[PDB]
Design a protein around this ligand. Structure first.
Ligand code: ADP
Ligand code: MN
Ligand code: MN
Length: 338
């Protein structure tokens, strides 16, 4: 009843070379050393890349796995060292189209921007036209509230309550959010993205995607919800494995309370991977308690995968798959085929 296997494509891993770039912090959290040992047993060479040195000397490389998200963000903020690292990486990539990059920098750049990510999700959803999926209205706000704010929100389908998030999707302060409940609450900061709050019975379904495989991990999440003051919170107090606070304590189950559909997750995963070219990412899905629809409220490059015990195996399987796809010239053409 598992019909997809990898034994045959794994045979081709012997002799392949995988470079990786990950922060020391992420290497520790993932225990990336254990993955590197797994690859050797299949006859792969794994090597940590040093982006301060020419990359040519470090190759040849068949695959590069990275999480350069934060370096890219710092390069965006004109950090000279980070700019140098990114340029050196890009130079290499450009010179070596045979090197498979997990994942392409254009996708990483999209995932660093909530406004861009949400618009991509919205368009993908409009293209799929599946009634089991809803795209919460959202918009980017680039000025402090004023006299026209209410009309602007209304015109774009924003309703109270809505959540305010930073436009930059990663790094310092990127997880500081606010829930705005009324007009008085509008003093809650550009550039931010506002997005309609969806009651979802305080259960978050983190879909952790590793190319062709995913694992759904339930997490705590904001409770259902008014002249009340806006709420300011930091999202790592909310939806981490051990998160526990009044913000996540559901008063009672209300409306539709169902687990996500694997059919739906599969179509979302395929569409996002095919459109963006990502493979190592997470989709945060909540179930709208008024419609039972799936709402994708966050998409993250190369997340923590806490609670995904099969990560290294899945990752090795994905590496085998991309090498197989490359070997047989399995290039996508045209638009995303639904
Ligand atoms: N539109 C929304 N409606 C209801 N809850 C939301 C919404 N967006 C985010 N959340 C809640 O806030 C948490 C953090 O939001 P998310 O967009 O995942 O930010 P982050 O990038 O910081 O993880 C989510 O895990 C979920 O609990
Ligand atoms: Mn999230
Ligand atoms: Mn996120």
């Amino acid at each position: 009843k598992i019909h997809h296997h990898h034994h045959h494509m794994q045979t081709f891993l012997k002799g392949k070379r995988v470079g990786y770039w990950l922060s020391e912090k992420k290497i520790k959290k993932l225990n990336f050393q254990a993955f590197a040992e797994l690859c050797r047993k299949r006859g792969m060479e794994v090597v940590q890349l040093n982006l301060s040195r020419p990359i040519e000397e470090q190759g040849p490389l068949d695959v590069i796995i990275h999480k350069l998200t934060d370096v890219i963000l710092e390069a965006d903020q004109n950090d000279s060292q980070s700019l140098e690292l990114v340029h050196r990486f890009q130079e290499y990539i450009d010179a070596h189209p045979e090197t498979i990059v997990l994942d392409p920098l254009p996708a990483i750049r999209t995932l660093l921007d909530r406004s861009k990510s949400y618009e991509l999700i919205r368009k993908i959803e409009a293209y799929m036209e599946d009634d089991r999926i809803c795209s919460p209205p959202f918009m980017e706000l680039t000025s402090l509230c004023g006299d026209d704010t209410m009309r602007l929100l209304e015109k774009n389908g924003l309703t109270f309550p809505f959540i305010c998030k930073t436009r930059v999707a990663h790094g310092t302060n990127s997880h500081e959010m606010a829930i705005v409940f009324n007009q008085e609450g509008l003093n809650a900061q550009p550039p931010c993205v506002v997005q309609n709050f969806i009651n979802h019975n305080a259960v978050l379904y983190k879909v952790f995607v590793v190319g062709e495989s995913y694992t759904v991990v339930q997490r705590p999440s904001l409770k259902n919800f008014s002249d009340r003051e806006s709420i300011f919170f930091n999202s790592h107090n909310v939806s981490k494995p051990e998160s526990s606070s009044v913000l996540t304590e559901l008063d009672k189950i209300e409306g539709v309370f169902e687990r996500p559909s694997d059919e739906v997750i599969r179509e979302l995963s395929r569409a996002l991977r095919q459109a963006l070219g990502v493979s190592l990412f997470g989709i945060d899905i909540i179930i709208n308690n008024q419609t039972g629809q799936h709402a994708v409220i966050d998409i993250n490059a190369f997340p923590g995968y806490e609670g995904v015990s099969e990560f290294f195996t899945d990752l090795l399987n994905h590496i085998a798959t991309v090498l197989q796809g490359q070997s047989t010239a399995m290039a996508a053409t045209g638009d995303v085929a639904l």
